[PDB]
Structure 1
Amino acid sequence: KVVSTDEYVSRTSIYYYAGSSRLLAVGNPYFSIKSPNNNKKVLVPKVSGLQYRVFRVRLPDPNKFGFPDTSFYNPDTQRLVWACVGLEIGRGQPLGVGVSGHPYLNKFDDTETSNRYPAQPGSDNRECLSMDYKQTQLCLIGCKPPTGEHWGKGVACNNNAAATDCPPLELFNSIIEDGDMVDTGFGCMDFGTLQANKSDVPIDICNSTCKYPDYLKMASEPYGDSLFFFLRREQMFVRHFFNRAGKLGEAVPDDLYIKGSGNTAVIQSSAFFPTPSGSIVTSESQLFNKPYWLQRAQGHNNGICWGNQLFVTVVDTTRSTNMTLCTEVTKEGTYKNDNFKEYVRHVEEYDLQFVFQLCKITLTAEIMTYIHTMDSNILEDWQFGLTPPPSASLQDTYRFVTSQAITCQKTAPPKEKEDPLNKYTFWEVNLKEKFSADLDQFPLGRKFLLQSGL
């Protein structure tokens, strides 16, 4: 029986603060350089706001504590789970958007205004251009890590069809981690497998598999534990129209139009492609740096962070400019072009401040089985399902280890390997001992109490 988190819990009146300090992360906008001698030795990373900025907290066990009151807390059955009731993001940059572009872009011509005939043969016609992207501001919170689809290839088919060669396809549903790339309008897809030139796409994203989040299946998720709340604001329009340069694999049927002759005898290709433009942004369009109060969640988990962990994400585009350097090598007297050298960087700062409420959860013989149905982990994180371990009778009983009748002993148990998150590179925060209760000494609890009717 599916039941929300409002039907078996007791709402206390104790509230505790969290707040994060200065995040340090500055890197190169385009790519991460490595050592030429070693691939695991970077000096600067690739940073951008167009990466999925997916972060995770570390919060301590509230049952690890000592307080003079335990009249509220029967330690036999009752337990303590954390829940978030307040939040704010802190950001620390002036507004500025950067632009990018492949230096060998697949622009054959422009197809907005005119085409004097005809297209010409040739195997090499690429050039540098540059353009902005889709703008946004967004976030999401849930105590399971957020998901996301992205399109890719498929298995081809059986060889019953002997018609042509056009490749298969599939979307791929995945929990997205930190660093992965958002789609910007070319579909949420792979650029290495689905494309083949890597010259339709700018270099930073030409070697990527961009995704789009699957809020839809997270909506049709039963409990709603990967989603508590989410935001979005986006706008777009075209800048110009250009065309690809390759063999169009598909022909066009003929009676749909009339063909011309002579100079107009050649039918030009129709492999057009647009190029984007975000609109003007204002400070009235700001999403961040405000409180968004929990009063009504979308699903069954009402703010309850299971596992004392949370999975926060954000994508911003208005602070996506890149500051660069321009230094010389030689001191001169006049202007030469060979003298000066550039280095470009990109800056990021995240600040995260929260308000909570602990809640005592009494454990009967019935709710313990209900959570046993959801997931047995938090149950044994409360250590409630135990079995008495046999096997005491051991007599490996010597005084010495360096002998002549060896048994080839083996050790180093790797036993705590239980985390699934080891394959997934996040950026994290351990905020565990940064806590107090004096919300008057915090620039958000003061705002909370006047909001809370206190």
Structure 2
Amino acid sequence: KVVSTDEYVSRTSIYYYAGSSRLLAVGNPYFSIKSPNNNKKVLVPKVSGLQYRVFRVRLPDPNKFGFPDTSFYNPDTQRLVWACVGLEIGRGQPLGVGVSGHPYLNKFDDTETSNRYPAQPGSDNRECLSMDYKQTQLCLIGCKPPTGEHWGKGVACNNNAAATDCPPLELFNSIIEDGDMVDTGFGCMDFGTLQANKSDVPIDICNSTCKYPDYLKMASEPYGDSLFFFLRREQMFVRHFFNRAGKLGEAVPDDLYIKGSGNTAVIQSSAFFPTPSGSIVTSESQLFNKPYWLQRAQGHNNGICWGNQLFVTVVDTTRSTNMTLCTEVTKEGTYKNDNFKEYVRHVEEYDLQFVFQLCKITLTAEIMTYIHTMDSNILEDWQFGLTPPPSASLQDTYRFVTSQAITCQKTAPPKEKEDPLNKYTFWEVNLKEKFSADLDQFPLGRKFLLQSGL
């Protein structure tokens, strides 16, 4: 039986602000560039305005604090935990959207005004094109990093059927690590396996697994530790209409169209696809540079961040401008084409502010069961319920370690293996040594006091 989080903690009458430094992030918005001589040696990392920027703070432990007043906290039974009440995402860049596009796009024709019979055959008609993406702004906060589904492969099943040749489909919920691609209107699906031509989608997506936030599964979580508070705002519309180039396996049935002859004896493609584009992007419908006073979460966890850490995820395409570099090689007095080498770069700027409120927990024995069925790892970081280790006397003592009374001594166990989340590349931000208690020396605590009604 679950319960809400306002019946076994208690809000104190003290408040803390912490704030990061200004984040720098630069790279190429199309591909990561590795070494020619080595695979693991990166040169410039692939970052664009299309990556799921995932930060993960590490708030310092409360119980390592020594206060002159030791009255409110009991170290015999009570413990502490942190809570989020105020939060800020900062952006410092001019507004502007960038363009992407595959130089070998699978466009057969254009199918909006005129496509005159007969068709134009030929075993190669890929060409270069580029287009805008579906603009998107959203943000999530939680103590567990947010989950995400995608559409992927799988076995159909055993070969009892002999019907056709079509690939199977299956959803898979995964863990959204950083660097993953945002959807832009082409299915929440893995293009690395479901596609084979690799010539229909721009290059940023084709070897990626673009995912999407499952609002439904996170809200339907029992404890609710993965959705504190969230917004989203996005729009798109159509630009053109094109069609694929290939043998459509699932052909058109015969009864639904009258067959033609002469010039009209062959059938064209029947697989169409549109190209998306963003609309105007105002500064009025922005989502950031605005405070967020959390009052009551939609889940049961009301801001209590177990494990002394948070997760913020945010995506934005409105600051996705693309700097175009142009250097030369030989100085001339007259113009040339082979005398300039060009580069493309994209920048990224972030900032984070946080308001925290510490909280004591009276620990009687019925409650720590509810902690234990939450997860076992919270209770051991407080070092509360443990066992006395037996096994007193040993005799592994020798005066000379490199001798001929050898026991082939081996040491250093891999016992510091504790983190199961180390298989995902986040963006760590060090917040352990960045606290203060005087709120009125900051551009957000002044906004905090005017909101508190003091």
TM-score bucket of the superposed structures, by smaller chain: over 0.9
CA offsets, 1:209-230, max 9 Å, x none?
A: 1111112100100121011011
After TM superposition, give the deviation of residue 420 of structure 1 in Å: 1.0
Structure 2 distance, partners of 1:99, 1:392, is 69
Whole-Å separation in 2 of the counterparts to 1:153 and 1:373? 35
Q: Residue in 1 aligned with 2:307?
A: 307
Question: Normalization by structure 2: what TM-score?
Answer: 0.99
Deviations 1:68-123 (A, max 9, x none): 11111111111110001001111111111110100000110001111100213221
**1:137 Cα deviation after fit:** 0.9
- Secondary structure of the residue that 2:193 maps to in structure 1? coil
Q: CA RMSD, aligned part only?
A: 0.9
Structure with the higher strand share, 1 or 2:
2
How far apart, CA to CA, are the structure 1 residues paired with 2:182 and 2:204? 12
CA-to-aligned-CA distance 1:34-90 (integer Å, 9 cap, x gap): 110111111111001211111100111110011111111111111110001001111
Cα distance in 2 between the residues matched to 1:226 and 1:121 = 53
- In the other structure, the counterpart of 1:214 is 214
Q: Residue 405 of structure 1: CA displacement?
A: 3.0
The 2-side partners of 1:119 and 1:195 are apart by 25
For 2:197 and 2:411, the matched residues in 1 are separated by: 51
Equivalence for 2:294: 294
Deviates more, 1:157-166 or 1:127-136: 157-166
Give SS of 1:448's match. helix
Distance in 2 separating the partners of 1:170 and 1:295: 38
CA deviations over 1:410-429 (Å, ceiling 9, x no partner)? 11122110101111000110
Aligned-pair distance for 1:182?
1.3
How far, CA to CA, are the matches of 2:13 and 2:324 in structure 1?
Answer: 51
Aligned-partner SS, 1:185: coil
Give deviations 1:252-294, integer Å, cap 9, x for gaps: 1112121111000111111111000111010101111101111
Q: CA deviation at 1:240?
A: 0.2
Q: Distance in 1 between matches of 2:359 and 2:228?
A: 18
Residue 379 of structure 1: CA displacement?
A: 0.5
- CA deviations on 1:147-193 (whole Å, 9 max, x unpaired) are 00000011121111111111111111011011111111111111111
Give deviations 1:352-410, integer Å, cap 9, x for gaps: 00111101111011111110111111111111111000112111111111112321111
Spell out, residue by residue over 1:232-257, the C-alpha distance to the aligned partner (whole angstroms, 9 max, x if none): 00101000000010110111111212
TM (normalized to structure 1)?
0.99
CA-CA distance at 1:4 after TM superposition: 1.1
Please state how far the C-alpha of 1:206 moved relative to its aligned partner: 1.1
Give me the whole-angstrom Cα distance separating, in 2, the residues matched to 1:101 and 1:85. Answer: 42
**In 2, Cα distance between the equivalents of 1:215 and 1:430?**
29
The whole-number CA distance in structure 2 between the counterparts of 1:60 and 1:3 is 27
Residue of structure 1 equivalent to 2:148: 148
How many residues are aligned here? 454
> SS at 1:273's partner residue?
strand
Give the corresponding residue for 1:321.
321
Structure 1 residue runs without a partner (length 5+): none
- The 2-side partners of 1:66 and 1:197 are apart by 63
- Structure 1 residue 31: Cα displacement: 0.9
Secondary structure of 2:370 counterpart: helix
* Identical columns (%): 100
Give the ranges of 4+ consecutive aligned residues of structure 1 lying more than 6 Å apart after TM superposition.
none
